[PDB]
Amino acid sequence: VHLTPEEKSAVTALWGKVNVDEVGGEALGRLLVVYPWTQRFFESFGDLSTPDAVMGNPKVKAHGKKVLGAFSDGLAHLDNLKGTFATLSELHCDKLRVDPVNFKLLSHCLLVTLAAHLPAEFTPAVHASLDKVLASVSTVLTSKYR
Amino acid sequence: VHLTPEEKSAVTALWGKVNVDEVGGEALGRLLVVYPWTQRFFESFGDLSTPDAVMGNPKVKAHGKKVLGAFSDGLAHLDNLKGTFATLSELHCDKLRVDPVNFKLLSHCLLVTLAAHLPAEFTPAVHASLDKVLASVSTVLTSKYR
Amino acid sequence: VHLTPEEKSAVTALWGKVNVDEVGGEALGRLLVVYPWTQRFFESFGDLSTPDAVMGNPKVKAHGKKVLGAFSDGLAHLDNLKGTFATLSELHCDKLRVDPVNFKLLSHCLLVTLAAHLPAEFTPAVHASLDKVLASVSTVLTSKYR
Amino acid sequence: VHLTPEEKSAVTALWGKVNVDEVGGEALGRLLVVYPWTQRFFESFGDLSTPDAVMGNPKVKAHGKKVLGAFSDGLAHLDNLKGTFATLSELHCDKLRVDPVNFKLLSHCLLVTLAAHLPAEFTPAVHASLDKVLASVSTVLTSKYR
Ligand code: HEM
Ligand code: HEM
Numbered sequence A, B, C, D: 001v002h003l004t005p006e007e008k009s010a011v012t013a014l015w016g017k018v019n020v021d022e023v024g025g026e027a028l029g030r031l032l033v034v035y036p037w038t039q040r041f042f043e044s045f046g047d048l049s050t051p052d053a054v055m056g057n058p059k060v061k062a063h064g065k066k067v068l069g070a071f072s073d074g075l076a077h078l079d080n081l082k083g084t085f086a087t088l089s090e091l092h093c094d095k096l097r098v099d100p101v102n103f104k105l106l107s108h109c110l111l112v113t114l115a116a117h118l119p120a121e122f123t124p125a126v127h128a129s130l131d132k133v134l135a136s137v138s139t140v141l142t143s144k145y146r
C-alpha cells in the first residue's frame, strides 16, 4: 500500500458512503456462493445450500458486518496494518488454517460488491487504490505462514 | 461450465443488456490501471501512464469492444467453447505469450465493470454463473500451454 | 495435455521407474509440511505437528500411495482423463471442498520429490511434459466447480 | 520468513554445497522451458526455441548465475531483505513489468533444481524453510506494485 494524499482522500470519500451492514454480508455471501469450497469454513453457520440459503443466513450477514468493521479499522491506520491485524493473523492462520488465496477471493468479492453499490464512485483509480490496501491487509493476515 | 438451463439462460439474459462499447473498454481499462504490469502487452497503444490516460485512450476502447465481441460469440457456442476460441488460443499462447494469470485478472476486471453497469441484475447467482463461463473461456484460451 | 508422441512416451518411461510407496508419501508429506493450511483436510490422520510427525505418520504414507495409484491409472488414459478422474472430481469438489489451488501445490510438491528421486531422469523437457499432465489432471479434478 | 536458529543453520548448510554456476542457469532454464510465456522477457537473449536451445544459451547460463548471486546475498541478510532488494524492486516492477506470479514460478523452478542437485540434503524441512525465504524475497521484489 503506497497511497498518495489524493488516493487516501478518494478511498476515504468512497468508504464514507458505504453501508457496512449491507455491503459486508453481500461480500461474504458472494464468496460462499461463487467460490463454493469456502463453505467448509462456515458450516457451523447452517444451511448454505443455495444462493437463497446463503444470502438469507443471518450468521453470514452478521459475520460479514464483523469483517468490514475490521477492514474500516484497517483503513483508519494504514501506517500500522501489522499492529492492527496481528491477532487476526493468528486466528486465521494458526487456528483456522485459512488458505492465503481465499483472502484474495474475499478481496475480489468485496470490490464487485462496492462496484454494484457505489457505481459512480467506484472509478478505475479508486478500484486501483482499494485493490492495494486490500492486498496489504491480506499480506498481514497470512503472515503466520512465512 | 456445468451450466444448468437456468444458469445458461440467466447468463444469456444479462448479456443482452450489456452495452459492449461501454463495458469492454472500461474492463480492459481497469486491467491496465489496477494491474499495471499488463501494460507491457499494449505498449503499442501509446499513453497509458494515468487512469485518465488509459481510460479515454481510443485504442483501449477499440480493443475492448473486440475482446467483448469474441466473448459474445463464445457465449453463443457454450457447448463448443474449445472449438470457437481455437484460433484465439494460438494467438494468445504462441504469438503473444500472455500469462495464464492475466486471463483471470481480466475476467475479474470484467465482473467488476459488469456489477457497476448492471447492479440490479448482478445477483450472486448470475455472478457465479458468469464466473464459471469466464473460467471455462480462460482454460480454453490457455489450452496451448498444456 | 498437448502431448506429442515423444512427450507422452518420455512421461510413460519415467513413470515406470517411480517407486509409488516411497514417492506418494513424501509428496503428500511435503504438502503438509510446506503448506500447513492443507493439514485441515487430513486432521483425521492424527499427529502432523512436526516434519517427522507428518512424514512417518502411516496414514500419510498410505494415502500417498492411493493418490499415486490414481495418478498411474490417469496416466494410462491420457486421451480420456476427463472420463477416468470423473468420480474423483465429485469427491474432491462436492464432498471434500478442496480449494483448486491445493491441487497446484500438491503437483508442485510431487515434481520436487520426483526430481529428488530421479535426478538424472528429471530433465527440463520431462519436467515440462509432466507439468502439463499434472495441470490437465488438476483442471479435470476441479471440473465440478466450473 | 520466520526462521528459527535450527532453520537458518539447515538452509545455510544446504546452500554451502550449492554450485551457483550450474544451479542458477538450470533454474532459469527450467522456467523458460516449462513456463514458455516467460520467454517474452528474455527474447534479447537469442534462440530459446527448444529445451536444447534454452539450456545451451550462455546468456541464460550467465544471467541465472547473476540471479542466484543476488539470492545468496539475500540469504546473508534476512534481517534486511527490503534494504538489500530495493533497487531490484524498481527494475523488475517499474522498468520490466514482471508479473508477480513469475517470481513464484522462478521460486518453484529453483526448488526443483536444488532437489535434483542435492537430493540428500533437500529434506521436507529445508524445503519448507527455503520456500518461505523465497516467498519473502518475492514479496520484496514486487513491492513497487502495492
Ligand atoms: C480478508 C479479510 C478478513 C478479515 C478482516 C477477517 C476478519 C475476521 C474477524 C474480525 C473475525 C473474528 C470475529 C468473529 O469471530 O466473528 C473473523 C473470523 C473468522 N474468519 Fe475471517 N477475516 C478475513 C478473511 C477470512 C477469510 C478469507 C476466511 C475464509 C474463507 C475467513 C474465515 C473466518 C472464520 C471461519 C471465522 C470464524 C467465524 C465464526 O465462527 O463466527 N476470514 N474473521
Ligand atoms: C478474456 C479473454 C480474452 C479474449 C476473449 C481476448 C480476445 C482478443 C481478440 C478478439 C483479439 C484478436 C484481434 C484480432 O486479431 O482481430 C485479441 C488480441 C489481443 N489480446 Fe486478447 N483476449 C483476451 C484476453 C487477453 C489478455 C488477458 C491479454 C493480455 C493482458 C490479451 C492481450 C491481447 C493483445 C496484446 C492482443 C493484440 C493487440 C492488438 O490488438 O494490437 N488478451 N484478444
Ligand code: HEM
Pocket: C038, C041, C042, C044, C063, C066, C067, C068, C070, C071, C088, C092, C096, C098, C102, C103, C106, C107, C137, C141
Ligand atoms: C493430484 C490430485 C489428487 C489425486 C489424484 C487424488 C486422489 C485421491 C484418491 C485416490 C482418493 C480416494 C480415496 C478413496 O475413496 O478410495 C482421495 C481422497 C482424498 N483426497 Fe485426494 N487426490 C488429489 C489431490 C488432493 C488434494 C490437493 C487434497 C487436499 C489437500 C486432497 C484431499 C483428499 C482427502 C482429504 C481425501 C480423503 C481422506 C481419507 O483418505 O480419509 N486430495 N484423493
Ligand code: HEM
Pocket: D038, D041, D042, D044, D063, D066, D067, D068, D070, D071, D088, D092, D096, D098, D102, D103, D106, D107, D138, D141
Ligand atoms: C525471484 C528472483 C529474482 C531475482 C533475485 C532477480 C535478479 C535479477 C538481477 C540481479 C538482475 C540484474 C542484473 C542483470 O542485468 O543481469 C535481473 C535482471 C532481469 N530480471 Fe530478474 N530477478 C528475479 C526474478 C525475475 C523474474 C521472475 C523475471 C521474469 C521472468 C525476471 C526478469 C529479468 C530480466 C528480463 C532482467 C534483465 C536481463 C538482461 O537484460 O540481461 N527476473 N534480475
